[PDB]
DNA sequence: CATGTAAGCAGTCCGCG
DNA sequence: GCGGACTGCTTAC
């Protein structure tokens with residue numbers, strides 16, 4: 003097999019590399035790497051190295067990496083550019099793996115672990131590590147085994163061995179319901195004392211050294227706890243055995259509270275699953291406890307136990323250990339679904355970077371572009387210092403707030419990367435400038451053509467049309483991968499709807515799920531077989547289609563994120579190729595494109611409807627337009643449609659056969675106007691929206707920019723079995739909105755859009771009557787809590803103190819000197835509740851850590867003093883009044899003359 | 906050592922015979 | 923009690 007790296011580190015003048023050799027064996031080597039950098043040299047000198055602008059360079063080969071760094075500083079002092087890759091381990095990887103890396107994940111050791119630490123005096127701080135580690139579960143991906151290290155004797159209690167037989171039993175039979183599929187994979191190791199547990203764990207670690215190290219919150223808890231605990235017991239050198247190179251870096255961050263540490267383990271790639279999740283999931287959660295995320299991702303119930311975690315080991319050691327095991331497994335289950343470890347590996351090896359560098363789009367692109375340019379013997383420019391400078395972004399149309407009955411939307415494919423490719427935007431393709439007219443003159447096609455020679459953006463930039471740019475070249479490759487995966491995702495989604503349709507008439511038979519590839523639209527013959535399947539098989543097929551869809555979503559959305567990240571990187575001062583001319587060439591072109599096509603669509607639809615000057619495009623944001631389709635439907639007349647699906651088919655055909663060609667003609671003309679390299683402005687129909695035929699539903703509404711709701715029948719070619727709400731920006735979409743309120747507001751919208759005013763009023767009346775009976779957590783607001791200390795004046799709110807911060811301070815006083823209460827962690831999320839006047843908490847609100855029950859001692863008072871009136875008004879009534887006033891609807895029946903009668 | 910900007914809404918402070 | 927300037931937070935793209 004071809005060789006591939008596992009990890010790389012620079013330590014002084016040495017590169018330390020863990021890798022897989024040609025026989026599939028794990029190896030380590032220390033290489034005294036001799037790096038090269040470059041300096042501009044006189045033309046006359048015959049060299050083979052050129053910078054990106056074609057200026058000749060001379061190579062400087064250094065005896066070691068220190069000399070190379072020292073030369074960089076001398077060059078800075080002289081005032082001349084020091085060219086080449088200055089992160090030498092990227093140079094090392096590029097030199098060592100001068101081919102496309104094909105890695106074998108079954109050879110890469112992926113470790114998932116977590117630890118337990120009983121603490122009778124508050125949260126066990128990793129920086130102090132003053133309490134025994136009393137459980138470790140460490141799953142190894144090569145062994146496919148859960149190694150369980152269990153402390154039997156502790157200063158906090160002596161306990162019996164954990165029982166695998168009891169662990170396997172149903173909870174309803176007093177067991178722990180450790181999943182049956184992992185019972186046989188558990189290797190259980192009890193220990194009589196912590197020192198031997200830890201020594202054995204370290205020996206184990208030596209035998210089975212993680213390459214990728216992950217788990218839930220490992221970077222801020224488990225890792226520094228383990229490291230510091232070992233340091234305290236055995237000494238720092240022993241603790242450094244966690245690094246295969248025996249080298250660590252300890253980073254301490256302090257504030258007006260305590261101080262935590264992050265530990266860098268050289269030779270390991272730590273990918274905390276919480277960080278992966280935040281980056282790659284495109285959710286925003288109200289809590290990031292593993293209980294909450296597992297429930298959200300997998301629909302499994304919270305791991306329940308009685309009493310405080312500080313007493314769980316002594317009262318129920320059996321459950322304590324089982325829950326440690328299940329917690330490690332849940333992260334594996336989330337990853338089986340989401341496939342973020344897979345994505346990280348793909349991206350890391352594609353770029354030739356340390357795997358943990360996938361968190362940095364700047365590092366990822368620097369490496370990609372470096373490798374691309376190195377192939378052509380080109381020399382990359384020196385990174386420079388740039389002052390931060392705001393710059394203009396996209397255009398958003400101001401909508402008229404209203405109900406909108408029939409809506410069709412259109413969206414440009416991968417807009418910013420498509421602009422890069424169309425215009426040919428790259429550091430080395432800049433041809434010059436032209437004198438700009440106001441943007442409106444380009445939009446209306448009245449400005450003079452910018453150039454008949456170069457490819458242009460309305461920001462004044464010109465680019466060469468006849469040569470390739472590294473940015474367009476490399477962005478296209480990732481774009482093409484993204485497109486492939488998005489196709490798989492959409493196919494799986496269409497396939498799901500086929501299965502949901504067939505679930506309306508399940509067959510009474512004993513059969514099996516069909517063996518199919520869900521990434522491809524089902525054939526007619528598969529559709530025939532599906533129509534004869536039982537509910538059981540259909541449901542299993544539906545689960546599999548949805549899992550296929552999720553896998554496709556991970557793959558495409560994060561590749562989209564990467565390419566869009568390149569367009570944003572051009573506007574980040576830390577990017578080697580930072581250049582506002584290019585960042586701005588993109589955003590300004592986008593503004594033109596949106597507003598140009600708005601004009602073209604208005605013109606086209608007025609023409610085909612035989613009218614003049616009417617506004618069809620009601621809204622647009624960045625690269626999308628929303629077209630009112632009322633006049634289209636009225637042109638033929640609603641009477642003519644047999645059912646909802648009929649008018650949906652009609653609009654679908656209209657968009658594809660009439661509008662899209664006109665949109666295409668409009669953009670091809672724009673491309674000629676800007677004299678661009680390649681026409682890539684591809685704007686396809688997205689949503690078809692409307693009320694069910696014959697109902698009193700309003701179809702959709704806008705309240706303002708970035709705030710709307712639509713009843714959707716078809717989305718990007720997926721014809722839904724059941725209409726689906728597309729809601730953007732409204733409180734239902736915000737993680738700060740209480741859970742039960744999100745639910746209630748969404749049902750309010752559903753009723754407005756599908757059923758009408760009366761249906762809304764009936765629901766509102768019910769919700770208002772039942773509000774007070776909802777669980778307090780379901781109705782609590784949520785907020786992130788930054789700069790808590792900043793506003794903390796002897797436990798009381800300083801000036802301008804935010805509401806949620808005030809709640810935290812109220813909480814801190816309520817739990818003061820009471821060691822069993824969970825602390826609010828800076829930058830994390832809190833539940834928030836308003837309090838009625840005169841409450842024993844001495845203030846107007848309380849806040850506590852999100853995803854948790856409020857501590858038992860103050861829970862009773864919170865429940866008694868909660869201000870339901872304020873809560874209902876702020877979180878529910880006020881947003882709903884926004885929705886209904888925009889929609890020209892009432893959520894409560896208004897008074898009228900009819901009130902004089904007895905109905 | 907590290908993607909971007911646009912923009913809505915809740916909240917605090919201040920002005921208000 | 924509300925609106926205007928301002929911060930904080932969060933979402934749309």
Ligand SMILES: Cc1ccnc2c1ncn2[C@H]1C[C@H](O)[C@@H](COP(=O)(O)OP(=O)(O)OP(=O)(O)O)O1
Nearest residue numbers: 413414415416417418419566567570624625909935
């Ligand atoms: C998250 C994020 C970071 C940086 N830029 C972002 C972004 N989301 C959108 N944008 C910018 C770049 C996008 O090209 C543009 C339009 O957003 P949109 O979400 O339409 O995505 P787009 O890239 O066009 O991909 P599709 O093919 O799925 O439509 O808005």
Ligand SMILES: [Ca+2]
Nearest residue numbers: 117118326329
């Ligand atoms: Ca635990």
Ligand SMILES: [Ca+2]
Nearest residue numbers: 413414415416
């Ligand atoms: Ca788009």
Ligand SMILES: [Ca+2]
Nearest residue numbers: 413415686718
């Ligand atoms: Ca599309």
Ligand SMILES: [Ca+2]
Nearest residue numbers: 507508533534
């Ligand atoms: Ca059937």
Ligand SMILES: [Ca+2]
Nearest residue numbers: 413414625626
């Ligand atoms: Ca869009």
